[PDB]
Design a protein around this ligand. Sequence first.
Ligand SMILES: C=C1CN=c2nc(N)[nH]c(=O)c2=N1
Ligand SMILES: C=C1CN=c2nc(N)[nH]c(=O)c2=N1
Lengths: 266, 266
Amino acid sequence: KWDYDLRCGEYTLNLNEKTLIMGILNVTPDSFSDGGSYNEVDAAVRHAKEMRDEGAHIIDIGGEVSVEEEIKRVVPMIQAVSKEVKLPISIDTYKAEVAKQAIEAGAHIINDIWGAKAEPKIAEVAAHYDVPIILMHNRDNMNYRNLMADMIADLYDSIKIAKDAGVRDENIILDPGIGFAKTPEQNLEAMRNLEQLNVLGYPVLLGTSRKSFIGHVLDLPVEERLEGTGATVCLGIEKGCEFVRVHDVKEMSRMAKMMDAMIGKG
Amino acid sequence: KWDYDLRCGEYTLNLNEKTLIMGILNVTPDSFSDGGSYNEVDAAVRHAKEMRDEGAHIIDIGGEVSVEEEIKRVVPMIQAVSKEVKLPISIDTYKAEVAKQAIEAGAHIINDIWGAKAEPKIAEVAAHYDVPIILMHNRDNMNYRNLMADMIADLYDSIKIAKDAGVRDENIILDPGIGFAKTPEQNLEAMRNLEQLNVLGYPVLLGTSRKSFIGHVLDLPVEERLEGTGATVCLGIEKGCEFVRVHDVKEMSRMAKMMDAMIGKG
Ligand SMILES: C=C1CN=c2nc(N)[nH]c(=O)c2=N1
Ligand SMILES: C=C1CN=c2nc(N)[nH]c(=O)c2=N1
């Protein structure tokens, strides 16, 4: 199906072998420093190692409240994790300056929850360093005419912005942005029709881990949503996503591996 | 989709509302009695109550090594669970005599892992008491020409046997019999093509809980197969099964409920 591998730098990710697991890194900050402290960075490195050991294929590191200090927080973490954990790293920001810094520090993938709409300059950064970028569907409103058709239009608006900056098709990944700009019922609708994103011809990453719509369905708090997240990950993979962004790496990695075997992946 | 409810006796089960959960009852027998003892029956009642509280919609009670004493073991359990747990009960046997007894004792559904091929008389019992019967795919060999097409042929051979005895279409349920007469790779194939069973027009029940093919994929022992079973339950429901037969009721009931919401069931 995919005639190219995801090229990340020192690491390369096969898209046909298996559903690739993106581990979400804890960011419990130090109430005492501007960022960089030992307790903060060591908990971060510790979490990455655990996630690596539980089957994560990528570590996702997020800083999100001002620009200049977002770098201070996230830069020291990328430096330590990239050094001590042999996995590609993605920076969860939508800020151009931030992204530059993070790749500078050793991040391999950009993760923009605004799909280059918040700060289009980020796309230039992406093209510049030749890294893969994740373009999530988002918008500042919920007034959809046709949810799915609008998501695809919105997404395509991100691709245009990215290609116009020189981003290669092979370094583009899409995300339906579940839990963003969508009502609980709209979140279910996107899930139910996720396979439509495939027509755009790009690897799709899904991120539904522990989110409120799972809560709204099950009536369960964030810590009780492991079975709910599992359902959305299974249905996601059946509908053709290549990546999942989860908190419970051990559990999700197991279901993902079983789905893969069943649906003939790899 | 289904224009009739599953009529069980005092209980009636809706097929359109939700994926219905079948709890597998523990049968740890008393090494000291022929059957009926307090420790054996009380653990049984206790397990049923827990499963009811965890969201089970049916309790499945199995005796399986001789005919005359299978009744001794399973009859006292049906009597106590039917009295103390307000849920329909299914008897997991393939033996005509056994089935008669169990419904006599209060069981509402028959669960035949040989699909009326081991003892066709069971079908007569089913028609006689007007109870729903589950016809599982099975055979004494693994020499398939075309797995799916043979399963459907084999299954249809069970339906013929059942209808010929007077069983009404509405009291017929099918099961692909995962883990029976199939290699691990064939178990994955049946899973991958489960939606084909739908053309026969009968509610389908899937039973994959903790089975060896999950083990063969994950390389994990029976007690470590909760995420693996979860994958097969999610994919099952997406492919249109109306029932699942699981051990981990709390967990499976949660994923099933989330799938239901996502795929527009209910
Ligand atoms: C809460 C968050 C933060 N960053 C994300 N990034 C991506 N790509 N997808 C998500 O669902 C997502 N959720
Ligand atoms: C191990 C067992 C015993 N009885 C069963 N009964 C049904 N209907 N389906 C199964 O998968 C099944 N597995």
